[PDB]
Design a protein around this ligand. Structure first.
Ligand SMILES: Nc1ncnc2c1ncn2[C@@H]1O[C@H](COP(=O)(O)OP(=O)(O)OP(=O)(O)O)[C@@H](O)[C@H]1O
Lengths: 337, 112, 112, 231, 113
C-alpha cells in the first residue's frame, strides 16, 4: 500500500442496478464511468435522480478496501434507542475483528483496536419503515479476500449477540465485485429514500470504501495464506458450550451407564457408536434390549441421538445446546445454588 | 366498533357484547380479531405488537364526540345478543349492536 | 375464467417484496451466488443457481457440489432443491408468510 | 344413539376418477359397488391393475368418518430426517386439531391428544423421487362437516411452519363427497405407482376412513352450531 | 371482435435474461426495446453478439398468442429416425390439444387437428 501504489482513490460507478457482465469488461460509457472526488460531487448535483453504485476497479489490480459494514435496523422491537446501541455495537464488532486479526492475520491486537475505535463514519436511511445504515471505519485497510474469509466469523457473531444491530448484520455484501451505494443517491428511479449524511463528517471522500489515503496514523493487515487453502473448523462449532457440558446432558438422558464414556473427545463423538447395556428398559423406546448401539450426529446446532440398523425400531431424541451467551451465564449462576 | 362514553371510558365491541375495561384496553384484541376482514396486503402489518399499539394510539386520537348509552327502554340484553320485546324476536351480532347496551344478564341465550 | 380454474398465482398479494424474498434465500447460501443478475420476478423458478464453493455447502456440509441448485415455489414457500442426484443434498424451505414470533405465540396457545 | 350409528362395516368404493353424478345415484355395478373388508382383498388380488376410489356412500345418513390427511412432498428425504420430520408433524397436528375440538366443538382437549398420539396408521408410496403417504388417525371419530369447518385452521397451520411434511399438507381434499384412493391400487391405468402398508398394521381394515368401529378407546366430537350460522 | 384482437404486429424483445422489474415498466432502452419485423432483422445483423428474448409486452391487454412447444433431447439421434419421429410427435401433440379443446374449450375437434 504505502503511498506509491495508492491508485485506489478513483471511484468506479455503475449507473443501473444489475448491470450485465458482458458490458463491464468493455467499459461501456452508458454503464460505467471513471471519476475523482471533485468530479463525482458535480455529477451528483447536475443529475437529481441519478443512481450511482460504488465498486472496485479490478480485483487482481487493487484489492485494498476500507473495512465497511452494513446494518438493517428492522423488526418490531419498541426499544429502538439509537445512541447506546451504536456505541455498544462498535464495541463487540471491534473485538471480533481484532480477535480475527490476531488469529489469522498476525496483527497486533491493540494497534488494530485503537485505529478502528478512533475514527469512523456513519450514514442513515431516511426511510422510517425500516432503518438501514452503513458504517465505515476509516483507519483500517485490508484486502478484500480476508473479508470473504471473515464472513463465517461475522455470521457466528450475529447469531449469539445481544444488540439488535449486531444481530442483524448483513454479511452477504462481501463477495466478488461488491457494490455499495454512494451516499445521497436513490436505489431505483422510483423510490425517493436516499442515504443522508451525519455530523460532523461532510465531505464525500470519507464515505467511500474505495477512497484510500493512508496517512501516518493508519494500520494495515491481510491474510498470509492464499484464499484457496482454507480448512473448515472441527465438528464442534466453538461458540456455544464446552464439550464436557454437552456429554453430561447426553448421559443424563440415558438412564443406563455408558460403558465407553471415556473414549469420547472433541472429534470422535460423531463416529463412535455408544455401546450401552440395558439393565433397565431403554429410556427412549421402553424396550428390554437392542440389537445395535446408539450413535451421535451434529446438525444445525443440535445432537441427533439415534440407533443404526433399523432406525424405525427406536425413537429419535434431540439434544439442544441453546447457543445464547447470557443464558449460559444464567444457567451457571443457578448451578452454584 | 369503538365508542366513547360520557364518563371518559372507552367501550369496545367483541364477542357480540359492549364490554369495556378501564384497566385492560381491549382495542388491541378487537384489532387482532378483525384482522381477518382486510385485504391480504394489510394483514401482515397487524402482527407486530408495536404496530398494533400504533394503530390503537392513532384510533384514540379520532374519538372527539361523546355518545350516551342505554337509551332504548324495551330491550333485554343477554350475553350473546339483545332480545327485543315489541315482537319477541331476538337479534345477535351486528343487529344487536346499534342499541348501546352496557349491562347484561350475564348468561348466553339459547333459542332451543 | 381463472376464478373457476385455480385460486392460485405465482405471487399473490400479502407476500413480501421479491427482493426481500431473495435476500432471505441469499443468507441461507453462505457462499456467494455467481449468476445472481439472472433472477427476477418471472424466471427465478427456471434459472439454475451456480453457487461458488469456497466454504463447505451450508445445506449438505459437503466440500463441493456437482450440479447447480434450483428454486421452486409451493404453498407460499421457496423450496430449495438440487438437480441431478436428489439424495446428495437435503431440503431447506424459506418461509415468506409473516412474523415468526406470532407463529410461536399461536403454537404455544395451541397446546392449551 | 342406536346400534347402527356405533358401527359401519360396509365400504363404498368407486372404479374410475371423474364418475358423472348420474351414474353415482343410480349405483350401477359398472362404476360403483359395495364391499366388505374380506371381499375388498379378493377383488384387489383378482385385479392387479384395477383402480378404486374410496368415498362416502350417503352424506346426510352417515357423516361419521375418521381423521385423515394427505401429504405430497416432491423431494426425497433421508431416513433420520424423515423420522425427525414425522415426530414434529404429529406433535403439531395433534395439538392443532385438539385446540379446535376444544374451542368450537365443546370437547375435552386432553382426551383428543391421548387418542391421537396413541394409535395412528401410516402408509408409504412406492415412488422414490417424492415422499407421499396417507396418515389416518385410528381412534378419532367426527363428522365430515367438522372437517370442512376445520379446513381453514389446517390451511393456516400448513402455511406457518418450517417442517417440510406439515407444509405440504393437501388441504384441498377436505370438500363435499371427497375421494381417497385405497391403498394398493393405481391412480390411472398408465401409472405404475401404488401405496404399500407399513408395520405393525397388517389388516386393510386400518386404512379405510369410512370404517367406523367405536371401541373403548375411541373419542367422538362435533360442532354444536351448524354450517349456516357460521357466516 | 376488433382490430386489436384481430391484429398484433409489434414485437417486444429483451436484451438480457431476467430484466429488473423496476426497469421493464419504465421501458429503459438499455434493457428493453420494441421493434418491428423489418427493424428486428437489421438489429440482429447490426450487432454480431446480441442476446434477445421475445416476450409479451402487455399481458392483460393482448393475451392472444400462437401455439408453441419446446423440445430438449440430450441424446444424438440419426436423421432418418429424426424424420420418422417428428410426424408421430406431431400426430400425438395434435391429438392432445384437440382432445382438450373439444372437452373443455368447445372448439371444433376436426377443425383443430
Ligand atoms: N447475493 C447477491 N449477489 C449479488 N448481488 C447482490 C446479492 N445480494 C445483494 N446484492 C445486491 O445488493 C443490493 C442491495 O440492495 P438492497 O435492496 O439491500 O438495498 P438497501 O437495503 O437500501 O441497502 P444497500 O443498497 O446499501 O445494500 C441489491 O440491489 C443487489 O444488487
Amino acid at each position: 500500500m504505502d503511498a506509491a501504489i495508492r491508485g485506489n482513490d478513483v471511484i468506479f460507478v455503475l449507473k443501473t442496478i444489475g448491470v450485465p457482465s458482458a458490458c463491464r469488461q468493455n467499459e461501456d460509457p452508458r454503464f460505467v464511468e471513471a471519476f475523482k472526488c471533485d468530479e463525482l460531487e458535480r455529477y451528483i448535483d447536475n443529475n437529481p435522480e441519478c443512481t450511482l453504485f460504488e465498486s472496485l476497479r479490478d480485483e487482481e489490480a487493487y484489492s485494498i478496501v476500507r473495512i465497511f459494514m452494513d446494518v438493517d435496523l428492522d423488526a418490531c422491537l419498541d426499544e429502538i434507542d439509537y445512541l447506546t446501541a451504536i456505541q455498544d455495537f462498535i464495541i463487540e464488532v471491534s473485538n471480533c475483528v481484532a480477535r480475527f486479526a490476531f488469529t489469522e492475520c498476525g496483527a497486533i491486537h491493540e494497534n488494530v483496536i485503537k485505529s478502528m475505535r478512533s475514527n469512523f463514519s456513519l450514514t442513515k436511511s431516511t426511510n422510517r419503515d425500516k432503518t438501514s445504515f452503513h458504517i465505515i471505519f476509516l483507519d483500517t485497510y485490508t484486502t478484500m479476500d480476508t473479508l470473504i474469509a471473515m464472513k463465517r466469523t461475522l455470521l457466528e457473531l450475529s447469531r449469539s449477540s445481544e444488540n439488535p444491530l449486531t444481530r442483524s448484520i448483513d454479511t452477504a455484501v462481501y463477495r466478488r465485485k461488491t457494490t455499495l451505494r454512494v451516499v445521497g443517491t436513490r436505489k431505483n428511479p422510483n423510490c425517493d429514500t436516499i442515504h443522508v449524511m451525519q455530523p460532523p463528517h461532510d465531505n464525500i471522500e470519507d464515505y467511500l470504501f474505495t477512497y484510500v489515503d493512508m496517512n501516518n496514523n493508519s494500520y494495515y493487515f491481510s491474510l498470509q495464506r492464499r484464499l484457496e487453502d482454507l480448512v473448515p473448523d472441527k465438528l464442534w462449532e466453538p461458540g456455544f458450550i464446552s464439550f464436557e457440558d454437552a456429554i453430561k446432558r447426553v448421559s443424563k438422558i440415558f438412564i443406563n451407564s455408558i460403558i465407553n464414556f471415556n473414549d469420547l473427545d472433541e472429534n470422535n463423538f460423531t463416529t463412535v457408536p455408544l455401546v450401552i447395556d440395558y439393565v433397565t428398559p431403554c429410556a427412549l423406546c421402553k424396550k428390554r434390549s437392542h440389537k445395535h448401539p446408539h450413535q451421535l450426529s451434529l446438525e444445525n446446532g443440535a445432537i441427533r441421538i439415534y440407533k443404526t440398523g433399523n432406525p424405525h425400531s427406536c425413537k429419535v431424541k434431540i439434544v439442544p445446546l441453546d447457543g445464547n451467551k447470557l443464558f449460559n451465564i444464567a444457567q451457571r449462576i443457578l448451578d452454584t445454588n | 366498533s369503538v365508542l366513547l362514553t360520557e364518563r371518559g371510558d372507552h367501550i369496545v365491541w367483541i364477542n357480540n357484547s359492549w364490554k369495556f375495561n378501564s384497566e385492560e384496553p381491549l382495542i388491541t384484541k378487537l384489532i387482532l380479531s378483525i384482522r381477518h376482514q382486510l385485504p391480504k396486503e394489510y394483514s401482515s402489518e397487524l402482527l407486530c405488537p408495536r404496530k398494533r399499539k400504533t394503530v390503537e394510539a392513532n384510533i384514540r386520537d379520532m374519538l372527539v364526540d361523546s355518545v350516551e348509552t342505554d337509551t332504548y327502554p324495551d330491550k333485554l340484553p343477554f350475553k350473546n345478543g339483545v332480545l327485543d320485546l315489541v315482537d319477541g324476536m331476538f337479534y345477535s351480532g351486528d343487529d344487536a349492536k346499534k342499541y348501546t347496551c352496557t349491562v347484561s344478564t350475564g348468561f348466553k341465550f339459547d333459542d332451543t
